[PDB]
Amino acid sequence: AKKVFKRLEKLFSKIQNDK
């Protein structure tokens, strides 16, 4: 569906790894 938007949220958790 057009709700890959959820995957975007998971990607955000990948950016908060260096923090």
From Swiss-Prot:
Coiled coil: none annotated. It comes from the Bacteria. Belongs to the universal ribosomal protein uL1 family. Binds directly to 23S rRNA. The L1 stalk is quite mobile in the ribosome, and is involved in E site tRNA release. Protein L1 is also a translational repressor protein, it controls the translation of the L11 operon by binding to its mRNA. Part of the 50S ribosomal subunit. This is Large ribosomal subunit protein uL1. It comes from Helicobacter pylori (strain J99 / ATCC 700824). The gene is rplA. The chain holds residues 2 to 20 of 234 of the full protein.
